[PDB]
């Protein structure tokens, strides 16, 4: 049956040559019947459910057959087989294509020349390829294109048997005259058949390809380009020309990514071919700028292929690319998208990276410094982890290159530590840096051994070298902070088990040297984080390192006391140089009091004493204040950690609660300070404190700690919000990109600090009103924070959320009048946005039913709460409900009259009579 | 009416293709850079609302202090 053949290919279960061979025998017995089922197979592969008949075939031309098949198409949707999803339709797409191809290849030695089957098929294909019906035009174009590839395979076979027979003719001439004669007739017969196969190929090409490669439908565009890429590859002698390649050239500029991608894979195929083509030179000279421009394709996948292709070009020829082009490709190792970054990494390796690795390491350093786009090397190292892993892991080569003696500039030494430190991090932590890596992909067995071998080797090499390097560069703050991060990647069992105790001591000394000789904030956090990573109770160096750590803080703590003993005498008016001395030890203490339990030294007093002296006299350098606040904060957390048990105590808590209590009041008055950074610091710690000491400190079976009852006051609740409105929501414009985004992230951090207090009931939820109102104004900056906070408030009290929402709108209403007035134009694009905001707010709405009710029931009270003082008693708040009308849609049908009864308790009978200005009332009630 | 997709236009004309060839500025873009400072790399790791709502505003470098904040979120 007609349908039997189509349903076979879709569901062949078959060696498809079996269907083709069975089809071919049906053609030898009767040609007309077999062609009818081939025609009907194409029609049906298009999704058409109609049928072409014998009488239609005999007397009807194809344009008429196609018009009748469109009539009877009898589709149920706009989908056809080639546009369906699912593996059964992708399988069908493959059966379809292979059937066309095996069919032609099996008819290639006889039937294909019978001047009957292939002219029928081709005529049908190109008539359907000309149809406005997309199912037919897309499917025929795919069929013609696969059809055509087969013919290219046939001509390539003919060309090979034409030359084999030429070699058999010259051989028998070179050594009987009735066989040279049978050979020259065989050569002429083969030439005739070549001519017939070129005719068919030319029919498809001029009849289908040159029209359909520029099809309105991009997928049809992509089918043609992929297939011309295939012929040019398979029969390069006949098809690798300017007159076929021009189509690929032009289409590279297509506006659709799928199309541009197929152009590049097609060209990629003509290059791993890689064999001395010169007609490719002319094409690349003309289209090289476009190919380079596609390294920044809007679509990423095309950019990768563009880069990959360009790397082939380098191999094929290299001279072609020119310097500016190469540098544009190099810049992309810094790209956000790793598939681009490592493609450019490969181009960079190939072009300019080709002990031994000593100079290759220097060139990486020179490259990283010459390309001033990134200050660090994390992303440079990750763009090349995959290709040049052999080199980026030669730490011994980098190691003694910073030590054992033109030499190295000082920027280059700093570039090399960061580069080296980056290789170490990516080698120990086998993941890319943030924004490059996958979603917690876990590790192959070989990855895991490679991950444990590297790690020991790092440990063993730099246990010995780390203390030397630190000594040589102890004074540069940039290079110490880097160096100090290596031990957080070491395996510490190796320190003990491999005769290394001497070196650990030698470094721990060099670490206590740097803390003493530095005041940089990063230098000191590195010192504290490493001492933490070395004081792990799982390993046997804890006692050795702990002793050194206890000696370090015995020194700094006793000194700090001595400095405060002098700095705060009543008549010892301290100068700015005495202020740097205090700041230096305080900062060193601060950095260590974060990551280390320093309650044994009881430092609350000193910090307290100074915070209370800056408040009383108001003369106190910001940095002493900021750092004291930090230190105090660390002192209370650490105590609360040791209230883990009460194996500890029952009486110490009264002191701990009092210190949190006073520290809260101290932060609260540093929050109104004039200096921005002091405010942000007091605010930051306050948000953390209030969350830590919330009611939440004991639902998790933590009930012992209830007496730690600090709820924020009404005073602070708003001064906290005052901080947000003055320093988070700021005037908007519309040191270049890098610093502004830093500032945005810190403003986001501060806003989240407060919304955490909202979502967690620390401060009354009414305060979110002045935050929700900024949802559209600050969408890109703070949008995501605002809509997850307001949905968290929704999730905990849906109607309270609605009650705060419309007060947010109520607070954009009285902003609008505050400067302008009560006669303000009520269709302004200011008003219109408040209306749009509300529309979007409405969409947030299952228990939605009373939420929306009181929703309306507060907007109603706000809309007749103040009457017009000199007017018909219109009201002052009449129009505000045009906004609320955007909430009517989400209302219930039953309370869409309970809207009224409540509406009517407020609305006088006289109001509805009046219209002009009163319109907001009319279409508020009309909404209901 | 019929759901069968009939295309009124089948081909892009010559002039539009000439236009595509002479202007691709709308299908190329500027380089989206990865975080180019160490601190901008940190703010991408701890940024996004999920991490920001589960981490304190003042960073605590020892898990014991950190835990004291994490424990109090539900």
């Amino acid at each position: 049956e007609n349908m039997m053949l189509f349903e076979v290919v879709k569901m062949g279960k078959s060696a498809m040559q079996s269907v083709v061979d069975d089809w071919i025998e049906s053609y030898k017995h009767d040609r007309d019947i077999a062609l009818l089922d081939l025609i009907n197979f194409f029609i049906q592969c298009s999704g058409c459910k109609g049928v072409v008949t014998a009488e239609m075939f005999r007397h009807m031309q194809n344009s008429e057959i196609i018009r009748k098949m469109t009539e009877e198409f009898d589709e149920d949707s706009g989908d056809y087989p080639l546009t369906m999803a699912g593996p059964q339709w992708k399988k069908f797409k493959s059966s379809f294509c292979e059937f066309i191809g095996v069919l032609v290849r099996q008819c290639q030695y006889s039937i294909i020349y019978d001047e009957y089957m292939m002219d029928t098929v081709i005529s049908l294909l190109t008539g359907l390829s000309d149809s406005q019906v997309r199912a037919f035009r897309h499917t025929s174009t795919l069929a013609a294109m696969k059809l055509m590839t087969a013919l290219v395979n046939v001509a390539l076979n003919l060309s090979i048997n034409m030359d084999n027979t030429q070699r058999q003719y010259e051989a028998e001439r070179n050594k009987a005259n009735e066989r040279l004669e049978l050979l020259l007739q065989k050569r002429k017969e083969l030439q005739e058949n070549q001519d017939e196969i070129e005719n068919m190929m030319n029919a498809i090409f001029k009849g289908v390809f040159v029209h359909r490669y520029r099809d309105a439908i991009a997928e049809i565009r992509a089918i043609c380009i992929e297939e011309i890429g295939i012929w040019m590859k398979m029969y390069s002698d006949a098809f690798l020309n300017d007159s076929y390649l021009k189509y690929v050239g032009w289409t590279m500029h297509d506006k659709q990514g799928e199309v541009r991608l197929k152009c590049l894979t097609a060209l990629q195929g003509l290059y791993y071919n890689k064999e001395l083509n010169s007609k490719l030179e002319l094409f690349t000279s003309r289209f090289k700028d476009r190919i380079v421009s596609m390294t920044l394709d809007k679509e990423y996948d095309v950019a990768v292929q563009a880069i990959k292709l360009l790397t082939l070009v380098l191999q094929s020829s290299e001279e072609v690319l020119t310097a500016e082009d190469c540098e544009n490709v190099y810049h992309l190792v810094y790209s956000a998208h790793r598939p681009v970054a490592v493609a450019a990494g490969e181009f960079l390796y190939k072009k300019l990276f080709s002990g031994p690795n000593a100079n290759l390491v220097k060139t990486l350093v020179f490259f990283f410094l010459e390309s001033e786009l990134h200050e660090h090397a994390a992303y440079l190292v990750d763009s090349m982890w995959d290709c040049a892993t052999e080199l980026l892991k030669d730490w011994e080569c980098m190691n003694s290159l910073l030590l054992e003696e033109e030499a190295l500039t000082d920027r280059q030494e700093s570039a090399l530590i960061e580069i080296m430190l980056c290789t170490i991090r990516q080698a120990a932590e086998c993941h890319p840096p943030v924004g490059r890596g996958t979603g917690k992909r876990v590790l192959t067995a070989k990855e895991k051994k490679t991950q444990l071998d590297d790690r020991t080797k790092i440990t063993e090499l730099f246990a010995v070298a780390l203390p030397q390097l630190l000594a040589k560069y102890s004074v540069d703050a940039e290079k110490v902070t880097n160096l100090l991060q290596l031990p957080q990647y070491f395996d510490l069992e190796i320190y003990t088990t491999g005769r290394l105790e001497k070196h650990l001591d030698a470094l721990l000394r060099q670490i206590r040297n740097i803390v003493e000789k530095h005041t940089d904030t990063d230098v000191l956090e590195a010192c504290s984080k490493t001492y933490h990573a070395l004081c792990n109770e799982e390993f046997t160096i804890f006692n050795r390192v702990d002793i050194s750590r206890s000696q370090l803080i015995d020194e700094l703590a006793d000194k700090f006391n001595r400095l405060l003993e002098d700095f705060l005498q009543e008549g010892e008016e301290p100068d700015e140089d005495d202020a740097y001395q205090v700041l230096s030890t305080l900062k060193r203490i601060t950095a260590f009091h974060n990551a280390h339990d320093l309650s044994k030294w009881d430092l609350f007093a000193c910090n307290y004493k100074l915070l209370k002296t800056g408040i009383e006299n108001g003369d106190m350098p910001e940095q002493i204040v900021i750092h004291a606040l930090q230190c105090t904060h660390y002192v209370i957390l650490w105590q609360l950690a040791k209230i883990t048990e009460s194996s500890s105590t029952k009486e110490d808590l009264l002191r701990l609660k009092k210190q949190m209590r006073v520290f809260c009041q101290i932060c609260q008055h540093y929050l109104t300070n004039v200096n921005t950074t002091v405010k942000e610091q007091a605010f930051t710690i306050l948000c953390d404190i209030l969350m830590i000491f919330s009611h939440q400190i004991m639902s998790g079976g933590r009930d012992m700690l209830e007496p730690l009852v600090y709820t924020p006051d009404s005073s602070l609740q708003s001064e906290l919000l005052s901080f947000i409105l003055d320093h988070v929501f700021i005037e908007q414009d519309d040191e270049d990109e890098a610093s502004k985004i830093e500032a945005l992230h810190k403003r986001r951090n501060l806003l989240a600090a407060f919304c955490k207090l909202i979502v967690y009931t620390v401060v009354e939820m009414n305060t979110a009103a002045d935050i929700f109102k900024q949802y559209m104004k600050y969408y890109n900056d703070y949008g995501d924070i605002i809509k997850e906070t307001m949905s968290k408030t929704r999730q905990i009290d849906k109607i309270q959320c609605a009650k705060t929402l419309i007060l947010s709108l109520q607070q954009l209403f009285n902003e609008m009048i505050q400067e302008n007035g009560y006669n303000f134009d009520r269709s302004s694009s200011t008003f219109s946005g408040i209306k749009e905001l509300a529309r979007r707010f409405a969409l947030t709405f299952l228990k939605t039913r009373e939420a929306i009710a009181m929703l309306h029931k507060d907007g109603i009270e706000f809309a007749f709460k103040e009457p017009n003082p000199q007017g018909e008693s219109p009201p002052l708040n009449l129009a505000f409900l045009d906004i609320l009308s955007e909430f009517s849609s989400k209302l219930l049908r039953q309370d869409k009259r309970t809207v009224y009864v409540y509406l009517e308790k407020f609305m006088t009978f006289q109001m509805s009579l009046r219209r002009e200005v009163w319109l907001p009332l009319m279409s508020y009630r009309n909404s209901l | 009416k019929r759901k069968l997709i009939v295309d009124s236009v089948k081909e892009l004309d010559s002039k539009t293709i000439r236009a595509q060839l002479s202007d691709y500025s709308d299908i190329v873009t500027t380089l989206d850079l990865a975080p180019p400072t160490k601190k901008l790399m940190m703010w991408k790791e701890t940024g996004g609302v999920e991490k920001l709502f589960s981490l304190p505003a003042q960073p605590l470098w020892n898990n014991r202090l950190l835990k004291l904040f994490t424990r109090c979120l539900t």
């Binding site: 300017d242 032009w250 002319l282 094409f283 | 010559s14 000439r18």
Partner: peptide, 9 residues
């Protein structure tokens, strides 16, 4: 380069 000059239609 002139064969690659688009003059179709």
């Amino acid at each position: 380069v002139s064969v690659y000059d688009f003059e179709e239609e």
